[PDB]
Write an enzyme that holds these catalytic residues in place. Sequence first.
Site, PDB file in Angstrom:
ATOM      1  N   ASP C  47      92.922 100.280  33.822  1.00 46.85           N
ATOM      2  CA  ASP C  47      92.368 101.720  33.772  1.00 46.85           C
ATOM      3  C   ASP C  47      93.546 102.777  33.313  1.00 46.85           C
ATOM      4  O   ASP C  47      95.127 102.349  33.916  1.00 46.85           O
ATOM      5  CB  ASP C  47      91.784 102.972  34.415  1.00 46.85           C
ATOM      6  N   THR C  80      92.271 112.784  30.483  1.00 47.52           N
ATOM      7  CA  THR C  80      93.916 112.759  31.074  1.00 47.52           C
ATOM      8  C   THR C  80      93.989 111.321  30.397  1.00 47.52           C
ATOM      9  O   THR C  80      95.422 111.240  29.868  1.00 47.52           O
ATOM     10  CB  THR C  80      93.609 112.077  32.555  1.00 47.52           C
ATOM     11  N   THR C  81      93.561 110.541  29.657  1.00 50.77           N
ATOM     12  CA  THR C  81      94.191 109.361  28.666  1.00 50.77           C
ATOM     13  C   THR C  81      93.989 109.942  27.292  1.00 50.77           C
ATOM     14  O   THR C  81      94.588 109.054  26.515  1.00 50.77           O
ATOM     15  CB  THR C  81      93.246 108.163  28.487  1.00 50.77           C
ATOM     16  N   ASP C 381      86.349 113.516  39.528  1.00 50.31           N
ATOM     17  CA  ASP C 381      85.880 113.591  37.940  1.00 50.31           C
ATOM     18  C   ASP C 381      83.972 114.388  37.785  1.00 50.31           C
ATOM     19  O   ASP C 381      84.095 115.496  36.925  1.00 50.31           O
ATOM     20  CB  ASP C 381      85.840 112.281  36.866  1.00 50.31           C
TER      21      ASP C 381
END
Lengths: 517, 508, 513, 508
Positions: C47, C80-81, C381
């Site tokens: 992830d 976030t990524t 989330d």
Amino acid sequence: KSRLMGLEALKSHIMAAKAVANTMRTSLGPNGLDKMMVDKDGDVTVTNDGATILSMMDVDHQIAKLMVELSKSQDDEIGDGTTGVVVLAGALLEEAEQLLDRGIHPIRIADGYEQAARVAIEHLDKISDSVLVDIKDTEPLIQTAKTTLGSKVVNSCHRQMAEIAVNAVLTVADMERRDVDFELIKVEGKVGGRLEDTKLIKGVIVDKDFSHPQMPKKVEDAKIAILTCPFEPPKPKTKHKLDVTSVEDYKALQKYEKEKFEEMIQQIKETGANLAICQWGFDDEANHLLLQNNLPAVRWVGGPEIELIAIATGGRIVPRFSELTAEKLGFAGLVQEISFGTTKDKMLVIEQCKNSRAVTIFIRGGNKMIIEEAKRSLHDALCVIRNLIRDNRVVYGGGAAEISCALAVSQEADKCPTLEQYAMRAFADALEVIPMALSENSGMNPIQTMTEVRARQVKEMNPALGIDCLHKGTNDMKQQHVIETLIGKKQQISLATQMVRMILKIDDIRKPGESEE
Amino acid sequence: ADEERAETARLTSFIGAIAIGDLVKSTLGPKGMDKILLSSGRDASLMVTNDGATILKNIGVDNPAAKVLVDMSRVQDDEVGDGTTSVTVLAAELLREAESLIAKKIHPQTIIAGWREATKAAREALLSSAVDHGSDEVKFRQDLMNIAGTTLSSKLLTHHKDHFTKLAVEAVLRLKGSGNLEAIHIIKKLGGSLADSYLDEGFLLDKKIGVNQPKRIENAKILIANTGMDTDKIKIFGSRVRVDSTAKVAEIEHAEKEKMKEKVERILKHGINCFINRQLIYNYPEQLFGAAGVMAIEHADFAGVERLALVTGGEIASTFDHPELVKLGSCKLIEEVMIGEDKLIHFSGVALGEACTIVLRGATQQILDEAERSLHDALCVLAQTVKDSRTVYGGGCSEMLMAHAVTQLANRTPGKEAVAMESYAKALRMLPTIIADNAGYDSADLVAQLRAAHSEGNTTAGLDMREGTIGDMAILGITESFQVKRQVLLSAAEAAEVILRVDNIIKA
Amino acid sequence: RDKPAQIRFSNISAAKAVADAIRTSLGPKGMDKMIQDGKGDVTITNDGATILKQMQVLHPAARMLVELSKAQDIEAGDGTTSVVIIAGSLLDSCTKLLQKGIHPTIISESFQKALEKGIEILTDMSRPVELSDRETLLNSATTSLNSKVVSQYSSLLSPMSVNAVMKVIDPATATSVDLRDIKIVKKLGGTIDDCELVEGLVLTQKVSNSGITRVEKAKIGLIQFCLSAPKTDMDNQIVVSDYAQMDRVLREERAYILNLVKQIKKTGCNVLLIQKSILRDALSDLALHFLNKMKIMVIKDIEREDIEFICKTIGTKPVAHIDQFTADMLGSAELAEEVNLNGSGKLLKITGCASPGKTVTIVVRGSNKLVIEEAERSIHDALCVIRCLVKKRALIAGGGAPEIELALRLTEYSRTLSGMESYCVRAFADAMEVIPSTLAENAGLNPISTVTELRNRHAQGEKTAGINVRKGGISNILEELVVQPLLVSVSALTLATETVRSILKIDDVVNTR
Amino acid sequence: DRDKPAQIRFSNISAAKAVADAIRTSLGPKGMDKMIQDGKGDVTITNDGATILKQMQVLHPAARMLVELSKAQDIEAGDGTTSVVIIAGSLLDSCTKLLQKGIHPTIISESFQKALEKGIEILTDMSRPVELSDRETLLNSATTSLNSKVVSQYSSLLSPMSVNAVMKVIDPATATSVDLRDIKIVKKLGGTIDDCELVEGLVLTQKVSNSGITRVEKAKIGLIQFCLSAPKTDMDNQIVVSDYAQMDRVLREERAYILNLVKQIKKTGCNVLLIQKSILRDALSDLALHFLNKMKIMVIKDIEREDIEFICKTIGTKPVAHIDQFTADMLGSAELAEEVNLNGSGKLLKITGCASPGKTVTIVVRGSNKLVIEEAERSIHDALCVIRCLVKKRALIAGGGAPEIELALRLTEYSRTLSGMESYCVRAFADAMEVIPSTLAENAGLNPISTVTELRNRHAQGEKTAGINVRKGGISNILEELVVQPLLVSVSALTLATETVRSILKID
């Protein structure tokens, strides 16, 4: 180990000597420049006076150290001349090398150098010969002081420092004593002051203050009880110590030490005193008894420091509390804490309107570097002025004197039959090293500056005309008032030859290398 | 020993000071480049810097010329205000032009006297350009807003700047001269307000009041003392020994609890219901104070207390055995307020006069500290403007004007220092080139035209280089006081010269 | 000097090169890492989000990437990524402009002007859903769940999230609702079915034995005091040097405490919660067993989180010693529940607490330690997506598809802007189109061909369509269930624009000594 | 910059000094012979300074001035060829010192000529007149100079003969200059030194004519520099062969030609003809020569280009390089032309008595063995060169190296009185002087520095005192043993030396 002889010996000597000489020449005279140097302690020391530079550096080879010792005697005798003596010494060794490769033995150099310096001392004797009384001296003295104070950098509003110094040499000294008085002189510096306030202390200052402000800020003339008695812990050399335990032994101790401190205050006050100076000072406890039987006191005076305060005031000793009498008590005019110009400078003065046998020269400045610089300006200034109080024979520095002498030496050099003649003329160029090195400091090319001065010495044959030494666009040494003691320059010239003569003489060297400290 | 010889000492002196110099030059002037300081050798972090104080101190000096300058400039920032960036950049720029001189072969004293006489010419020309703008006191207020506005910007603050212009001007104005950390005490805390600062009426203290000690005191009379127990008081009947075996370790701890009760009765004697001690105790000792009814307020500040003392006629001083030794301060209520979302014990009863307390609210501690230092330099500049209400137009407009006047005299007056007077003038103009290219204007073109204009008598127009344009400085407000600039110029010339004088460095 | 030129080029090289590696995001791409550390430990990672927060670097420029991810989580909790990869695009822009002779201060300025225009255009394309309306919230929550690991526990999770956030909510489009009010607790036992939303405040703690209050009525305890008993904080004159003498001191010590806990119960306590840090031992280890008897809850060595929440929400303030009696500044309460569920778990629920009109708590349950983990990420989330709407509403394309879309609209606005700044922003429009490209590139072999193609398919659809990034195929992207909040992409641009800008700003080497 | 000439100039100085070092130990009569290896691998033993430099030098620009410097010396005095190198290199030692100090090269070059002008004054006062019309005075000064020269063995006999040639060429009291452009050195095989004699006219080399007349009185000096035959074909003659016929056709032209030329010469009136070689004139006929001799005209055929230019000035027999230019004006007037076959075997043409501008003397030097002839050729040269130097410059100075210390000492003192930036240059220059008598003393054998220190002190007190004496090796008066040098021989050494040192300093 290796045996170094001859050329090996003299090569090493130039290499060591020069390194010291180069820093000094670029810090020479009142056009002189500050040198900011770092230690390996992460600290920074800003220097300019030739002696501090010698203390700072521990460069290789013995020759460095021999210059160091030489300068120290001269700081006490003359004062200034510390930069001047060393740069002149390296000039001799550069010239000796020029003559050494031509094929001249160092013993030839040695005798002819010693003989040339005697030509120069005779030339310098001509300029003055006056000795005058102390009062008359005071105006010439202040003019000399500017210069000397100027060669440790800055001299603007430093006229206090000069005028306090005339008082300072007079008190400690006689006119024809012919001895030193700089072990009677205490230099003092404290941070937070100004360089615009300089004070003459006709007694002594302890950095300590009253135990309370509530105790009186004045004490009568005389009646000082000099004491070694504790009112706080005296830190005994006895051994195993034991502490109180619990409420009861705590209380017993407290009441005991309180009881003994009150008895002590009373016996001091009965034999006649109103100032206690105690080796081992006052505690919070002790304060209570002392206000209550009302007697101003200083808390803490150093072990040796108590002796220094006694001799200075001329006061009569009382060693300890066991030794209390009314027939022996120290001297004072008043004992009062003094604020000089700021409340950042607090010293407490035991000042004299009686006998004074020492003088404390109290100079201030606002930061650590500023007091350093000011103490060294003023001590050296004081010393040159002591040579002049005795005999007020004055010559004008800046290298003017040296040029005249160079003309005198160069002629006398060749009128002897012996093989020294070549040395003696190199001696004449070697005197010229000092206005040459001054020029580097001024902002002027070394060569043309010396020869401008020289034409003017062909006319008069006396230094009182020259070049710039303050920088103001005058060609005068008598409208600039660049003045050094006659004995002082004569001293830089004779000492430097005497030293370098040992160095030319010795060519017998046992080192593994080429230099060892 | 180590001897670094005549050329080499001067070279170390130039590069070292140039490198430190280039750090504070980005932030200096209108908005251009900033510093973001990169920390890895102490600890691994990045830091957002804009103040010259932070940048210069945090990075060591290991180049001997560099040491001297960072120390002179840091002290100038305290006194003068904005002496950190200003002194260091100009001192560095002068050494660059020394480098030139020396290879050419001019002696160090020609350079030293040329720069110095040229500083005297700059100062005389700054006086010329400076004119009053404090001839009515309401006009004076406005003059101070401009000066303040300039300092504050080009230092990262989110919305705390907007308050501070007005704040600093108020504080200085009423007091007249002097310090102003006594006329506005800076309490820094985090609140629910993202970057807002306001004037408190009273002194407010951070710490929750819990336990049986009550959160609302009515009819406060405050007994001021600067010392007290850390958490345990030693005394005449306080001294004991109760520990010498392993079980006796808990018994002495019992005993220390008892010593806390002994200190309570000391205040109880006075009958003064509010006792302030400057040190914090724990929650457990607090129960004893509150029970008795002579309340202990711990973790007190000296600055807060000083604010109350001045209006009420109290005295800030230790010693207490009776309350007649130390004069009393007053407040009505000391009431637990919540400001932000943090619970505070707030003293209220007196307002203003000789001191206010200013409470800043952010959410990061970095913002508060950053804000104080920006503000600090400002308050110092405004302190000097009360004495000399002259003000002179800058942004780089001042620095070219003095330089024009120094170039004119550089031709006429000296016998050998000509080259050096010019070098002094060109170094002032270095500061307005660097900022030009950050802005998006041509450096060369800026320094060569307007310089003649402002000198002839268009002093208003000056350098607006946050847009790369010529703007009015009377209307845009990129004008700082006469005093602040006069002193940093003096300082920077001396500092360069000191290290320029150095021809040998010995290391022992 | 030469110190400013070389630092900017390397720092930009060094973040960007790591950002190239890192850009393998969305879907199955690149090849796994089993990692031999610089300290000799075996670590396995998957992830993108979890990696970036964890990432341990010492290159000053690369540290920016670590912390960029964390701010994003706190405002959005989404993307976030995403925020890192698009930041790497801005870095790609910075080199090409240095060669052109556009100065570094100028490239900073342009980032602001890129931000100002860009977010306004994001708001334009967006369809404005209501932040207080449940139906649209319910669709949006499905989008985030179905993009994570869950696809069957998704059913349970969508409705709990709409309810949870509803409790904390404030009507406005202004910044409200946080995970400083949304309290997230784990509990061993229960299942993903049994997850429970309590509208009040519930704290996560461990409570000794089973056999304690599970009924109504409680006075919630926030104490900061240690007991007074023999060999505690009260005097004893009995000094031990024997096992027997030890036994006496402890017996009389525990005995007095049995009396003490009755005064604690007199108060109404059925919950007591002990301070974190002792003042000797705090309430002794003996006291805790006695308290259990009175029917009163425990936790010594309490976590930090609990202390912050109790005081804020319920108004609960410290109280005086028990021998001196409690001060009664404690808040209101009415439930002391020890939650056991399928034979495991220890928990405190406080119901009938006072509130400021905020603060919900969700309890996260799972019969196995991994099964709790699976609920936990997915819910996080889903809570956060609905959250983002209150803070700033609307829905735009998801997966980072509007940053590709934004590129077309944005080139036009640069040309007509006709500044110094125009060139910097135009070049960034082309860089935002690389993000599906670069993602794929690293995985395999044959890079070039696919890379050009994905940019054609998205662009040609125009200002309202392109390729989807969660299904593929050129279809309408603005509403189709490939959505994310306005907040996520505006926040991402904003954070990127600040961190990157900072690399440009420095000059010359700097390293604290 | 001028850095790179600075670096080039030092390199040039060092190379010039090294070559000059060999010659300091070759100086004076006590000089050390040098064994010199050519690029040809032959060892050459010399003690004459000049030829060492010439025969092989290094490829640096100051080295070249040295060959030039001594070449100039030869024409000007003919003497002090060795000494002139010595002072040049010694000056270049002095210059490095000045340069480092910061005395620019322009200063050192004008100061070096100024110091020559100043040097010559001091020298002259010491000098003392002698007669220049009296035979005896010139001989004593010449005899002293001969003992000092390398050659001396037969120079006793050649010295009165050297004066006699020179006395005739002195006719007024000014004594002209006397060059070698009037005194001719001719050698003859066979004979002794006593047989040598001064012929009033000129003696010419060789003598081709055995069909001619052998003694003709009252002769007319005719000069041929025109052909005696029609031009080359392939030989100096027009005639060539490649067919029987081919020779005939050229002969028709030649025959006509040879009669008109031989006859034309006779019609104008000549009884001496001076004819050059068959490689220096494009045609000459044996046939034309047989007739030209048989008309009773005295002929010398075969003589040099150098000889032909010599005759033309001295005996006023001006060019006749064409038929048109034989007119009466060109012809000389000879009193006698005569063959001599005595006093050395072989036949030379003597013309005794000649009508001449100036006055031209020729010395037929002679000797028994080939090497005897060469030793006496050296010996007259040395002897004549010193005489010519004294007639130019009437006063007389001492040798022995004492003048050289005496100038220096005065020049040091005067420089200091005068002062100036150039003081250093004139003082170091004077010390440059101190090297040469010192270098001389070492060769005489006595510790050198000690010798030159002591002579300085004798000069300082007394003045005209001690000098280097060849007997003692050292310090004894040169007043008791006359060692004289002409005044020009010392003026030359100094002024030429300075000029060379001037060029090198000026040279980039």
